[PDB]
Design a binder for these strands. Structure first.
Lengths: 120, 63, 113, 332, 198, 50
RNA sequence: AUGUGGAACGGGGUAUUGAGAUUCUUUGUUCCCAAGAUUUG
RNA sequence: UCGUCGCAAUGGUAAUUCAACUUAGUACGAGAGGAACCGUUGAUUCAGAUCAUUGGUAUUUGCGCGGAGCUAUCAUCUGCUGGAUAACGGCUGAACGCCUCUAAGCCAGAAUCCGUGCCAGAAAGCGACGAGG
RNA sequence: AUCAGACGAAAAGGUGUUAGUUCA
């Protein structure tokens, strides 16, 4: 819903977000405008209003004036929106050896430095 | 479509293995055991219609 | 793909053993930086960016037990981005990881080692 | 220094590994020892096939950086009784064995040559003069104890170590009743037990020991974990370094003895990996606190061939014996 | 038998299927090995032996039905174990050649082998003598590119395994049964079956 | 299948109806508990909605 | 601290080295030796 | 007084883990997607480390090599685990004859918490034990 | 009262109550 989308956008802006006060107000306005634009993409009038509010807040003189401008921008935006692996397998079982004991018994490989398996 | 092996196992083909009148004087304990059986047969990331098959206590009355 | 990456010599300029028309394929980047013996990695043709399983690795590659074996050069057989060997036939020894990384690369290889 | 589990870093005073936590026991468990003291003989890498389901090298031979630990059979020469108290675990009474070696008696004496070497000499007297006192001490332990541990001293004499003072560690008998633990220790008083009895080598042994002094760098007691033994080779066994594949007899001691330890003459335990502390250090091989069921513990050890290339120095042969005919007749 | 080892359709690369025995390689899926056992394992032993520790040893296995003349790059212990594992009737031999992937190089059909164009004549003849199939030196990886069997596996497009150029790697063609990967095209599998008189 | 396959399957668990009745009876208590436990902006929004 | 004592040599082994030399070990020799002060108990 | 062998008041904490091939193209899913699942192989980062073997070694001042040993994963180890719970989900069951996770209560259940394990120990924390008149 | 009490977020929410008033 429009109200649900506005509440989600406001919550996201709150979670994310004289010269310092003006910059903070402008950043909050820009973040809200970006969130609204992203939701719309997923509008032009809202972006124009936000840009005008940002320009007005860029020349702010008092913190209260910046707060009022931010509140007005938020209200305008709200109005616009409202408008295996363990089994053991044995290779000796699958053998064709004549003696089952010999198949299950290993054979020498190397002895006294010489490969017994390769020399027998 | 995939039967659940019972020691619950093969729950919709689940390789993981978990752990019908049930007479008992302790009605609360019997009901709690029934809830545990229902809790065991819990569907995860499955549609309700697809997971309509489940272990639900048919009735509970004095034996 | 296939197989699990193992600690080995990251040898692969990765000589393109695969007969893709390139003798050498200098590794541009490591896919997923260096690629072990038999690991496909993006390689720009040096002589003659595409995956290049190192069929031969100049650096000594510790074997299963720990037997380190060093090939003549770090030769990375050319492999297409899909996974199959980009070249018609790989040349020289082909590492076991290259077989795991791409059975076609080992299949194209004249020698598997 | 990022892990404050080991920070602050201070050197551990006791060279011997201390069992800060013995394994839990129950009456169902048979009476047995939980720890056995060993010496860092060496840790050369030896080949062994890996029979592990799903292993990339399933049924494939693997060279493994294993570790040989010299383990002279421990001698139990006393008992301690531990009473469970609301303020902790208290030592009720300690009942030593009647007779003690000079080495363990030397442990108490800083110099041992001082005047008379009187360690437990009158204690040995009252032990024989009044065996009933020891009987009452045993009775007091059985009646008023929960944790029974046994005094054990090291047979350094078997090892090629200059140290004469026998390291004494309070190994804890685990399993059965307290009286059963006292009875086993009493019948085993002044007697030695091989590590082969203590550990079966298929068991996963969390060996613990003190890290070496780097020159606070090092010298800190540490507890290794997940170290399954691979071969508890006995010292009398000259086939210990000869597996079935390399059937040719070869002692665990490789050519040129051991690095700064000398040859191995007594029982040893083979275990993969490395442990804190330098060569020939008293290492506490102990039962695992957790009965871990990892596939590495499940899979058995089938050792392919023991490396016996030269210790201190360099050797290109498994043993000189085969190298004798391998090379041409020497000038001699 | 168009079946893929695990999710890999390189049945020929994984297993060098031959009439007497399918030279499978270790590391393949146990169910797939059993599936290969059910399809043609009884007639053609499908023991999964990784020649030289290679899961794609079937590609490089130059051992055909009459003779297991696989390259000498195969592990001697595994070859000795395979000699006891498999019947002595198969002429098991170690092909000590520079082209260690001789099985991929040689299209060792049970009726007549087809060695690589650059494959050594003596090595091809030795493989031919054991396999009892006249070698034909003729991609160089004739065995890998085109599946070869006495029954007949047609030829590569230059294609089995969903049009893969390496038909031999994709399809484990054997005289007893011309197996293939699960990814093999239905038309390609039918053509291979028709070529194999099946 | 195709189109509204899920709806077709529904047309073709029964304990949900019993669970819904239990939830409906507990809804009156749940609303009071949620409203009393809510804090911050959400609490003000819930109070304004109610 | 009167001894299978410890230690140094005469050495040797181990390896190094690549015909030669060196350095843990030694039923050899000797030194050392019931080795003195201080400190408390 | 000197030692032996131990308990632990009190702190600190670690492994974070994933990643990629099976387990999988697996049940389910028209199918695609994809569980459960199972080992293996390794790896991101960080911690305590042995120094066997190897590389370096480096007054062996022995003969560039370089013993004896040191450092270096550059040879290697190498980093725990059972309860109580949050949300949520239930059983019992009033209030509110029923009903109702809840109100008396209980269980399941988090990457959370607590203990376990590890690192220390309280220079003035203790116990057993041998040896001042 | 698991943020007791003792010394604006405060509007409200309280299936949190104690007493009473009105209609009943």
């Amino acid at each position: 819903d429009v109200n649900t989308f506005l509440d989600v956008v406001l919550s996201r802006t709150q979670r994310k977000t004289i010269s310092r006060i003006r910059g903070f107000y402008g950043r909050k306005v820009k973040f809200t405008q970006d969130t609204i634009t992203e939701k719309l993409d997923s509008k032009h009038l809202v972006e124009n209003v936000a840009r005008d509010y940002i320009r007005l807040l860029k020349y702010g003189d008092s913190l209260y004036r910046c707060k009022q401008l931010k509140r007005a921008a938020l209200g305008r935006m709200a109005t616009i929106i409202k408008r295996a692996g363990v089994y053991n397998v044995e290779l000796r079982d699958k053998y064709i050896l004549q003696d089952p004991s010999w198949k299950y018994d290993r054979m020498p490989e190397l002895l006294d430095g010489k490969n017994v398996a390769d020399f027998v | 479509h995939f039967p659940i092996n019972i020691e619950i196992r093969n729950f919709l083909g689940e390789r993981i293995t978990r752990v019908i009148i049930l007479e008992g004087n302790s009605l609360e304990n019997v009901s709690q055991s029934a809830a545990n059986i229902k809790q065991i047969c819990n569907v995860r990331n499955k549609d309700i219609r697809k997971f309509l098959d489940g272990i639900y206590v048919s009735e509970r009355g004095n034996i | 793909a296939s197989g699990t990456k193992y600690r080995m010599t990251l040898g692969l300029i990765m000589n393109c053993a695969d007969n893709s028309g390139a003798k050498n394929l200098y590794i541009v980047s490591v896919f997923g930086p260096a690629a072990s013996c038999g690991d496909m990695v993006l390689a720009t043709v040096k002589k003659g960016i595409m995956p290049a399983i190192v069929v031969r690795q100049r650096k000594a590659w510790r074997r299963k037990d720990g037997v380190y074996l060093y090939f003549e050069d770090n030769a990375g057989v050319i492999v297409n981005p899909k996974g199959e060997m980009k070249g018609s036939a790989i040349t020289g020894p082909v590492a076991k990881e290259c077989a795991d990384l791409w059975p076609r690369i080992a299949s194209n290889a004249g020698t598997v080692v | 220094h990022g892990s404050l589990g080991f920070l602050p870093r201070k050197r551990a005073s006791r060279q011997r590994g201390k069992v800060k936590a013995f394994p839990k026991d129950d009456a169902s468990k048979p009476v047995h020892l939980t720890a056995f003291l060993g010496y860092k003989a060496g840790m050369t890498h030896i080949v062994r096939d890996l029979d592990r389901p799903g292993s990339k090298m399933h049924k494939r031979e693997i060279l493994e950086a294993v570790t040989v630990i010299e383990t002279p059979p421990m001698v139990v020469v006393g008992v301690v009784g531990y009473v469970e108290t609301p303020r902790g675990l208290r030592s009720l009474t300690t009942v030593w064995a009647e007779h003690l070696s000079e080495e363990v008696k030397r442990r108490f004496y800083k110099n041992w040559f001082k005047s008379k070497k009187k360690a437990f000499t009158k204690y040995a007297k009252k032990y024989a003069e009044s065996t009933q006192s020891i009987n009452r001490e045993l009775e007091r332990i059985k009646k008023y104890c929960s944790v029974v541990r046994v005094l054990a001293h090291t047979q350094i004499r078997k090892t090629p170590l200059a140290q004469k003072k026998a390291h004494l560690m309070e190994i804890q008998v685990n399993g059965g009743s307290v009286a059963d633990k006292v009875e086993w220790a009493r019948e085993h008083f002044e007697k030695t037990v091989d590590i082969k009895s203590t550990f079966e080598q298929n068991e996963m042994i969390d060996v613990i020991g003190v890290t070496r002094g780097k020159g606070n760098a090092g010298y800190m007691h540490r507890t290794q974990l997940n170290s399954k033994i691979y071969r508890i080779g006995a010292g009398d066994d000259a086939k210990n370094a000869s597996t079935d594949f390399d059937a040719t007899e070869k002692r665990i001691t490789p050519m040129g003895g051991f690095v700064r330890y000398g040859v191995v003459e007594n029982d040893f335990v083979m275990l993969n990996g490395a442990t804190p502390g330098p060569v020939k250090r008293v290492l506490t091989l102990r039962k695992s606190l957790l009965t871990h069921t990892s596939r590495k513990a499940l899979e058995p050890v089938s050792l392919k061939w023991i490396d016996t290339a030269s210790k201190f120095g360099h050797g290109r042969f498994q043993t000189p014996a085969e190298a004798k005919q391998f090379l041409g007749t020497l000038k001699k | 038998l168009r079946a893929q080892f695990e999710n890999s359709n390189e049945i020929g690369v994984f297993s060098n299927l031959t009439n007497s025995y399918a030279l499978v390689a270790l590391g393949g899926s146990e169910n797939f090995y059993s599936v290969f056992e059910a399809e043609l394992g009884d007639v053609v032993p499908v023991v999964h032996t990784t020649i030289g520790g290679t899961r794609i040893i079937g590609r490089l296995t130059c051992g055909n039905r009459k003779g297991l003349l696989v390259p000498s790059s195969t592990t001697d212990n595994e070859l000795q174990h395979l000699r006891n594992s498999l019947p002595d009737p198969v002429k098991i031999q170690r092909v000590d050649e520079r082209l260690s992937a001789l099985g991929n190089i040689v299209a060792c059909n049970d009726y007549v082998a087809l060695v690589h164009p650059d494959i050594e004549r003596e090595t091809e003849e030795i493989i031919a003598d054991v396999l009892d199939v006249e070698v034909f030196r003729q991609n160089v990886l004739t065995g890998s590119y085109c599946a070869l069997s006495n029954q007949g596996a047609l030829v590569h497009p230059r294609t089995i395994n969903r049009g893969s150029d390496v038909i031999g790697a994709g399809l484990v063609v054997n005289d007893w049964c011309a197996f293939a990967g699960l990814d093999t095209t239905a038309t390609e599998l039918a053509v291979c079956e028709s070529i194999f008189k099946l | 299948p195709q189109n509204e396959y899920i709806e077709e399957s529904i047309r073709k668990r029964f304990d949900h109806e019993e669970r819904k009745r239990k939830k409906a009876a507990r809804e009156a208590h749940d609303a009071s508990l949620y409203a009393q436990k809510t804090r911050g902006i959400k609490a003000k929004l819930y109070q304004e909605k109610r």
